[PDB]
Amino acid sequence: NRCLKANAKSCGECIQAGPNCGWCTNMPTSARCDDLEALKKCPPDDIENPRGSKDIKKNKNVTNLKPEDITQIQPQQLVLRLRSGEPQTFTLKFKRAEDYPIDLYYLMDLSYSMKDDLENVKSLGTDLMNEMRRITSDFRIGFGSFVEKTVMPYISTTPAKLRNPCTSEQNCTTPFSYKNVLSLTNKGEVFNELVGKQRISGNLDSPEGGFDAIMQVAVCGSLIGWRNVTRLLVFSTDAGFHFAGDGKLGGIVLPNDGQCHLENNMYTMSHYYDYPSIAHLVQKLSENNIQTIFAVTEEFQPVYKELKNLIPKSAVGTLSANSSNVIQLIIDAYNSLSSEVILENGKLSEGVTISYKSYCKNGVNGTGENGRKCSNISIGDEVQFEISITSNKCPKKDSDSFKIRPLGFTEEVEVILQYICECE
Amino acid sequence: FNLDAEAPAVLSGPPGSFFGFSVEFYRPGTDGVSVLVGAPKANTSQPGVLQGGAVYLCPWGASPTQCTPIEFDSKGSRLLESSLSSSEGEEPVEYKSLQWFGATVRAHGSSILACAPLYSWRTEKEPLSDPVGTCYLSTDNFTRILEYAPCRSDFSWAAGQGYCQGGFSAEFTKTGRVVLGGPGSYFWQGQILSATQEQIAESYYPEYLINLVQGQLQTRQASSIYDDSYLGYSVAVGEFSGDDTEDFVAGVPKGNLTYGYVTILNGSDIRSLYNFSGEQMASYFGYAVAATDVNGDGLDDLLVGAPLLMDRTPDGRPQEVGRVYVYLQHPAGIEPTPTLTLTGHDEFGRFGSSLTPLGDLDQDGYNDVAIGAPFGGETQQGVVFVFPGGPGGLGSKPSQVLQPLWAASHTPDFFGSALRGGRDLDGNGYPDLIVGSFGVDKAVVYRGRPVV
Numbered sequence: 001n002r003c004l005k006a007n008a009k010s011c012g013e014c015i016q017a018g019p020n021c022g023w024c025t026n027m028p029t030s031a032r033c034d035d036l037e038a039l040k041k042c043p044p045d046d047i048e049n050p051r052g053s054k055d056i057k058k059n060k061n062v063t064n065l066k067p068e069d070i071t072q073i074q075p076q077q078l079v080l081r082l083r084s085g086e087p088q089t090f091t092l093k094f095k096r097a098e099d100y101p102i103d104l105y106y107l108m109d110l111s112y113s114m115k116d117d118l119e120n121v122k123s124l125g126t127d128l129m130n131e132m133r134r135i136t137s138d139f140r141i142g143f144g145s146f147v148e149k150t151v152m153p154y155i156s157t158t159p160a161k162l163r164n165p166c167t168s169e170q171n172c173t174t175p176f177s178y179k180n181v182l183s184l185t186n187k188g189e190v191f192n193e194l195v196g197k198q199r200i201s202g203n204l205d206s207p208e209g210g211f212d213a214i215m216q217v218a219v220c221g222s223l224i225g226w227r228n229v230t231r232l233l234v235f236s237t238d239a240g241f242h243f244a245g246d247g248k249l250g251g252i253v254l255p256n257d258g259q260c261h262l263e264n265n266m267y268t269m270s271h272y273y274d275y276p277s278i279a280h281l282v283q284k285l286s287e288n289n290i291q292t293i294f295a296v297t298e299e300f301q302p303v304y305k306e307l308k309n310l311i312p313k314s315a316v317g318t319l320s321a322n323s324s325n326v327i328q329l330i331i332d333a334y335n336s337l338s339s340e341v342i343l344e345n346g347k348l349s350e351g352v353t354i355s356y357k358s359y360c361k362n363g364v365n366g367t368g369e370n371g372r373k374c375s376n377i378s379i380g381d382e383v384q385f386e387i388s389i390t391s392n393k394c395p396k397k398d399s400d401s402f403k404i405r406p407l408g409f410t411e412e413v414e415v416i417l418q419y420i421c422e423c424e
Numbered sequence: 425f426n427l428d429a430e431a432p433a434v435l436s437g438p439p440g441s442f443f444g445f446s447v448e449f450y451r452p453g454t455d456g457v458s459v460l461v462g463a464p465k466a467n468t469s470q471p472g473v474l475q476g477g478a479v480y481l482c483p484w485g486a487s488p489t490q491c492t493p494i495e496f497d498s499k500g501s502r503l504l505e506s507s508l509s510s511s512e513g514e515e516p517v518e519y520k521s522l523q524w525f526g527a528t529v530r531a532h533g534s535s536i537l538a539c540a541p542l543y544s545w546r547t548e549k550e551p552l553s554d555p556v557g558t559c560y561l562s563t564d565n566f567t568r569i570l571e572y573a574p575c576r577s578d579f580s581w582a583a584g585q586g587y588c589q590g591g592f593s594a595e596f597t598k599t600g601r602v603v604l605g606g607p608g609s610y611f612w613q614g615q616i617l618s619a620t621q622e623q624i625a626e627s628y629y630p631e632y633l634i635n636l637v638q639g640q641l642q643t644r645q646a647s648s649i650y651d652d653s654y655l656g657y658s659v660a661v662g663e664f665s666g667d668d669t670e671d672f673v674a675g676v677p678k679g680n681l682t683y684g685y686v687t688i689l690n691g692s693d694i695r696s697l698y699n700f701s702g703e704q705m706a707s708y709f710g711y712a713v714a715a716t717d718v719n720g721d722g723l724d725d726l727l728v729g730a731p732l733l734m735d736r737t738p739d740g741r742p743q744e745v746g747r748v749y750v751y752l753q754h755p756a757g758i759e760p761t762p763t764l765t766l767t768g769h770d771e772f773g774r775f776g777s778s779l780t781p782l783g784d785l786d787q788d789g790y791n792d793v794a795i796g797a798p799f800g801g802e803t804q805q806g807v808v809f810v811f812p813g814g815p816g817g818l819g820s821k822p823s824q825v826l827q828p829l830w831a832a833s834h835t836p837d838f839f840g841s842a843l844r845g846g847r848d849l850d851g852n853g854y855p856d857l858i859v860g861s862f863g864v865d866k867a868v869v870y871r872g873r874p875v876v
């Protein structure tokens with residue numbers, strides 16, 4: 001065997017030589033490190049054999065009423081003690097909560113082609129509030145608008161086009177990057193009133209500055225008013241999107257820093273930081289548990305369908321030319337997003353690897369990266385994941401920890417890893 | 425691996441000038457050898473012009489280098505000749521403030537090309553703010569100075585060439601022909617334009633703003649489905665068509681639903697010869713391009729950078745890292761699939777933001793390449809990777825990693841955001857490498873030396 005062929009000079013070496021290796025303390029010296037059955041073939045007390053284990057610390061039961069006190073993932077914390085090469089497996093239980101609150105921020109393109117949309121969205125407040133009663137008892141809505149970076153070449157910069165980026169007859173307000181019009185509120189009537197006060201704008205190039213705005217909504221936190229609940233971001237537009245690299249045209253080369261720059265509810269730094277990259281958005285949307293609904297016109301479905309494939313917990317729906325259909329669009333996208341859970345883990349150390357197996361309704365079982373997924377999850381449905389973690393020849397000298405969580409949820413599982421590289 | 429990384433020469437410009445944004449070798453003869461450094465946010469003495477930008481001439485020699493601005497254009501804006509009457513009084517016909525002159529700097533022989541891609545003008549008709557871009561060309565040891573703004577044409581506004589930003593990228597061919605990229609033409613379809621120096625000089629008249637160069641080569645306007653592609657975001661030159669006339673390599677990073685592609689154009693009639701496609705939406709494939717023989721068979725090979733390329737780590741985490749693609753030319757053509765790829769390892773590092781041929785650094789018969797990752801490194805100051813050529817193309821591992829020896833500041837250095845290699849400054853037989861770090865207004869010159 002390999003315990004012997006390892007020539008374990010010490011106990012530590014013997015343990016790191018394989019999870020089936022024991023070490024006697026009572027014929028070469030390295031023969032003290034043999035298979036556990038071989039060493040017996042040595043008093044069982046004189047055999048040193050530290051095995052791994054899973055020890056649960058926090059294990060609040062899935063619930064069946066503040067958002068803080070509702071549990072959908074279980075357990076919430078545990079310790080894995082890892083013999084090198086020996087995997088430790090624990091089970092994650094996920095139950096979709098019954099009456100979970102929803103925050104929906106409506107982020108809207110206000111370039112001129114969206115003028116007609118704006119006239120239908122100004123009643124969305126109360127209409128969406130009404131429709132949301134078949135989904136949740138606790139709904140809040142907010143509104144933000146975007147156009148473009150306010151620099152050449154994306155906007156015309158004649159004094160006159162700065163005042164009015166559109167034609168003289170059209171009475172467009174000055175171009176702007178992002179305005180938080182209304183932080184989240186349960187008052188649908190306030191949504192209606194403020195949205196009805198907003199003026200349509202304009203700019204020059206077809207793709208728009210919405211990524212600048214998405215970033216702000218994701219990272220600005222208390223300014224937007226996000227709770228620890230379902231966070232829906234509806235991104236509504238009839239055009240493509242600028243992204244990192246496009247800034248260079250306007251002499252903007254500093255990458256987006258992913259931090260809030262809202263003053264008086266206006267994004268003030270669009271002239272200074274580049275548009276975000278897709279990757280940067282993936283990071284900050286996921287970190288901030290934002291589920292994104294791309295509500296866009298048929299012309300741009302192809303673009304946004306590709307974008308959706310890159311942005312975790314996103315959905316695309318086909319917006320009508322004046323947003324007449326956006327409520328159903330939202331409901332249908334929400335149903336898509338909610339019926340699937342996707343697990344992501346934080347970074348592991350070198351030599352540490354993780355494996356997922358999923359066990360979903362109707363006996364559909366996933367492995368590989370499909371092991372992180374369960375689909376077709378109805379309200380009150382329970383699904384489970386078997387997660388396996390394995391360390392190799394002892395990384396670090398202390399313990400590590402990482403989080404596993406379903407994307408779009410505040411809830412998470414803290415996994416603390418302790419590596420067995422010695423004896424006692 | 426034989427770049428003197430312990431003792432590089434550091435060039436410094438005005439703080440906040442973005443000195444190092446563009447860099448170049450200048451050699452009329454080896455006697456007057458020098459480094460050129462663009463500083464597109466530099467203040468100049470041009471009347472009425474705020475941050476017009478400058479290009480610095482940095483003499484190379486035994487003594488410590490000191491850089492001085494080159495005077496391509498000492499005047500402010502020309503005037504709308506119809507305005508000097510009227511009633512509103514004088515009105516400028518062009519806008520040189522914030523024009524980023526020096527954003528691109530290139531040299532061939534005793535000729536220097538410097539571009540201001542954010543230069544804009546009014547037109548002489550209805551008032552616009554058309555950022556057509558402009559370039560200045562000094563020829564024959566600074567004796568003659570020409571302006572070349574081929575997008576400053578009779579076709580105005582974004583529908584035409586008004587937003588062209590000609591000179592956004594630029595290169596010289598081996599014959600000294602000027603090649604410009606302008607990514608804004610025809611609702612950001614983008615455009616390549618090219619003229620010989622003789623053609624530019626033959627029709628240069630600062631009296632007229634629209635100086636139609638006859639015989640000019642330029643890509644043609646396409647249908648609206650090609651809008652917002654940014655052809656000419658980057659350009660390089662190399663021979664890919666079997667003759668003795670260098671061809672034009674051009675990035676089209678937002679083409680094909682933002683998957684991007686790179687095109688190679690016939691240097692004789694600017695007709696399309698090859699396209700190479702990106703592999704991921706918005707990876708900015710074609711952010712940078714380069715052409716050089718990296719495997720010693722005498723055929724130019726294509727390199728393309730996609731600095732926003734996102735991959736997944738072994739434990740399932742997406743990360744922005746960037747990637748460079750290499751396509752080897754063969755006698756029958758060039759295959760559309762990359763021969764090899766190099767992927768960055770620093771998250772958000774923007775590996776592949778810049779590329780440069782190094783020539784043969786170690787003199788082993790294979791030309792080598794440098795690739796920048798401007799936000800790479802442990803303190804995100806930026807990094808430059810040297811990769812060796814070889815019979816099957818580039819090595820998979822860097823043979824040298826260059827990093828700024830100075831400490832990080834509160835703002836990014838952008839070390840490696842600009843590169844220029846493959847020329848021998850001191851003439852010791854070994855090629856040398858210029859690296860920009862415009863975030864701290866510096867440029868670094870690495871000397872190649874004998875090493876084993």
Ligand SMILES: *[C@@H]1O[C@H](CO)[C@@H](O[C@@H]2O[C@H](CO)[C@@H](O[C@@H]3O[C@H](CO[C@H]4O[C@H](CO[C@H]5O[C@H](CO)[C@@H](O)[C@H](O)[C@@H]5O)[C@@H](O)[C@H](O[C@H]5O[C@H](CO)[C@@H](O)[C@H](O)[C@@H]5O)[C@@H]4O)[C@@H](O)[C@H](O[C@H]4O[C@H](CO)[C@@H](O)[C@H](O)[C@@H]4O)[C@@H]3O)[C@H](O)[C@H]2NC(C)=O)[C@H](O)[C@H]1NC(C)=O
Pocket residue numbers: 438439440441465466467474475
């Ligand atoms: C090249 O030269 C230019 C020109 O000198 C130089 O640009 C200046 O750079 C300094 C340093 O960063 C800037 O100083 C800051 O000014 C902030 C407020 O400035 C306001 O007031 C300016 C003066 O107004 C009077 O004078 C002008 C000119 O005669 C006149 O037109 C006015 O009517 C008025 O009489 C004004 O020029 C300036 O306008 C610019 O900026 C605003 C942005 O709001 C923009 O709207 C304008 O279009 C124009 O671009 C502005 O209105 C001041 O708050 C700030 O102080 C804060 O920041 C510093 C950090 O920098 C902190 O330390 C401090 O505690 C504060 O928090 C700072 O002092 C100056 O404004 C620039 N001027 C211009 C015109 O851009 C470049 O730096 C030079 N570049 C190089 C490479 O050398």
Ligand SMILES: *[C@@H]1O[C@H](CO)[C@@H](O[C@@H]2O[C@H](CO)[C@@H](O[C@@H]3O[C@H](CO[C@H]4O[C@H](CO)[C@@H](O)[C@H](O[C@H]5O[C@H](CO)[C@@H](O)[C@H](O)[C@@H]5O)[C@@H]4O)[C@@H](O)[C@H](O[C@H]4O[C@H](CO)[C@@H](O)[C@H](O)[C@@H]4O)[C@@H]3O)[C@H](O)[C@H]2NC(C)=O)[C@H](O)[C@H]1NC(C)=O
Pocket residue numbers: 613644645646647648650687696697698699
């Ligand atoms: C690499 O990838 C790029 C991008 O995909 C490829 O470039 C594209 O190639 C296609 C196919 O060649 C181009 O479409 C064609 O354009 C030609 C040329 O049009 C120009 O020249 C004509 C005279 O020669 C002129 O009449 C045209 O003027 C019209 O069109 C313009 C623009 O719409 C308009 O402004 C004018 O008012 C006129 O309306 C124009 O100046 C055109 O002739 C083609 O039409 C024929 O073929 C099509 C397809 O079969 C057919 O439907 C038509 O009926 C007609 O028979 C066609 O439109 C496209 O413009 C290129 N795009 C860009 C951005 O360059 C490239 O080919 C790839 N290279 C390789 C090696 O694969």
Ligand SMILES: *[C@@H]1O[C@H](CO)[C@@H](O[C@@H]2O[C@H](CO)[C@@H](O[C@@H]3O[C@H](CO)[C@@H](O)[C@H](O[C@H]4O[C@H](CO)[C@@H](O)[C@H](O)[C@@H]4O)[C@@H]3O)[C@H](O)[C@H]2NC(C)=O)[C@H](O)[C@H]1NC(C)=O
Pocket residue numbers: 361362376
């Ligand atoms: C998402 O999950 C839902 C909930 O499970 C699921 O809906 C269910 O689909 C199954 C089919 O996959 C339905 O099962 C049928 O039920 C009827 C009685 O209502 C039976 O008569 C059927 O029996 C036939 O089919 C069997 C197939 O094994 C045969 O063995 C048998 O001999 C019969 O031929 C069958 O069992 C079930 O009724 C629904 N439930 C509801 C509430 O609608 C939905 O399909 C899933 N969607 C996916 C996976 O996309």
Ligand SMILES: *[C@@H]1O[C@H](CO)[C@@H](O[C@@H]2O[C@H](CO)[C@@H](O[C@@H]3O[C@H](CO)[C@@H](O)[C@H](O)[C@@H]3O)[C@H](O)[C@H]2NC(C)=O)[C@H](O)[C@H]1NC(C)=O
Pocket residue numbers: 302680681683701702703704
């Ligand atoms: C032009 O643009 C189209 C998009 O309209 C590009 O098509 C897309 O290509 C990518 C990469 O090849 C495809 O994604 C890949 O999917 C496979 C299979 O799932 C997977 O193994 C890869 O890792 C990658 O995710 C994508 O599906 C595809 N989209 C569509 C709508 O076809 C195309 O590649 C671009 N280039 C050319 C020359 O057409």
Ligand SMILES: *[C@@H]1O[C@H](CO)[C@@H](O[C@@H]2O[C@H](CO)[C@@H](O)[C@H](O)[C@H]2NC(C)=O)[C@H](O)[C@H]1NC(C)=O
Pocket residue numbers: 068228410
């Ligand atoms: C919503 O969830 C966030 C994240 O879990 C909470 O913020 C955390 O608060 C704890 C308090 O002990 C800190 O240790 C964490 O560092 C915080 N995390 C972040 C990212 O800030 C927040 O308190 C929750 N809000 C409510 C109302 O329960």
Ligand SMILES: *[C@@H]1O[C@H](CO)[C@@H](O[C@@H]2O[C@H](CO)[C@@H](O)[C@H](O)[C@H]2NC(C)=O)[C@H](O)[C@H]1NC(C)=O
Pocket residue numbers: 359363364365
């Ligand atoms: C997916 O995995 C589950 C669990 O391993 C399988 O369901 C079990 O099937 C056995 C069959 O004898 C039953 O005795 C168990 O009671 C089932 N589990 C539960 C929790 O009820 C299922 O068969 C697997 N499906 C596939 C296709 O492999």
Ligand SMILES: *[C@@H]1O[C@H](CO)[C@@H](O[C@@H]2O[C@H](CO)[C@@H](O)[C@H](O)[C@H]2NC(C)=O)[C@H](O)[C@H]1NC(C)=O
Pocket residue numbers: 665666690691692693697
């Ligand atoms: C690049 O363009 C040149 C034209 O500038 C092509 O050369 C022409 O090819 C035709 C084909 O029969 C000849 O009739 C012309 O006399 C050629 N003209 C010149 C100036 O050589 C050349 O073939 C193109 N290269 C490729 C690879 O397509």
Ligand SMILES: *[C@@H]1O[C@H](CO)[C@@H](O)[C@H](O)[C@H]1NC(C)=O
Pocket residue numbers: 120320321322323324
């Ligand atoms: C919005 O326009 C659509 C056509 O795109 C039309 O069918 C619908 O009636 C309009 N909405 C309202 C509220 O009038």
Ligand SMILES: [Ca+2]
Pocket residue numbers: 147148154203204205206207208209
């Ligand atoms: Ca726009």
Ligand SMILES: [Ca+2]
Pocket residue numbers: 113114115116117238321322323
């Ligand atoms: Ca509309």
Ligand SMILES: [Ca+2]
Pocket residue numbers: 663664665666667668669670671690691692
């Ligand atoms: Ca050729």
Ligand SMILES: [Ca+2]
Pocket residue numbers: 716717718719720721722723724725752753
């Ligand atoms: Ca070659």
Ligand SMILES: [Ca+2]
Pocket residue numbers: 783784785786787788789790791792812813
């Ligand atoms: Ca070499």
Ligand SMILES: [Ca+2]
Pocket residue numbers: 847848849850851852853854855856871872
């Ligand atoms: Ca040298």
Ligand SMILES: [Mg+2]
Pocket residue numbers: 111112113206208239
């Ligand atoms: Mg628009």
